[PDB]
Design a protein around this ligand. Sequence first.
Ligand code: SF4
Ligand code: SF4
Lengths: 64, 64
Amino acid sequence: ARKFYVDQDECIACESCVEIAPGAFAMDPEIEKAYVKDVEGASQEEVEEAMDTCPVQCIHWEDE
Amino acid sequence: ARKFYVDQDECIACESCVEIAPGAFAMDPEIEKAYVKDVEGASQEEVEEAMDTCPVQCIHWEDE
Ligand code: SF4
Ligand code: SF4
């Protein structure tokens, strides 16, 4: 799967990514930021949907 | 994009598919059989892991 990750510094905890892609994203109960729980847990189009929806655009691809 | 479903007549409720791909599979608590809750809820490779692991080979691609 092309790699992706949440930049948790920026994350506003809206939960939209955990709603769109629940096999790939989860909330960390004690820092209140979202993180990738599985890079293979959503198809590439569902990942993109969650990335394009992020209000603060903090989920990034890492090709680099 | 992908179409795959569980043939619930054969499903023995082992839960390996909802363990491997939780964003794509869920247990229907009523009949205790697995079904696809979101066809984009796992990458193609993660869906294959679940299909190949299925003990009764009851998860199929549409057109098989
Ligand atoms: S969609 Fe963006 S801001 Fe919202 S919880 Fe997910 S990573 Fe954080
Ligand atoms: S892995 Fe196969 S038998 Fe096991 S719960 Fe899923 S569909 Fe049913």
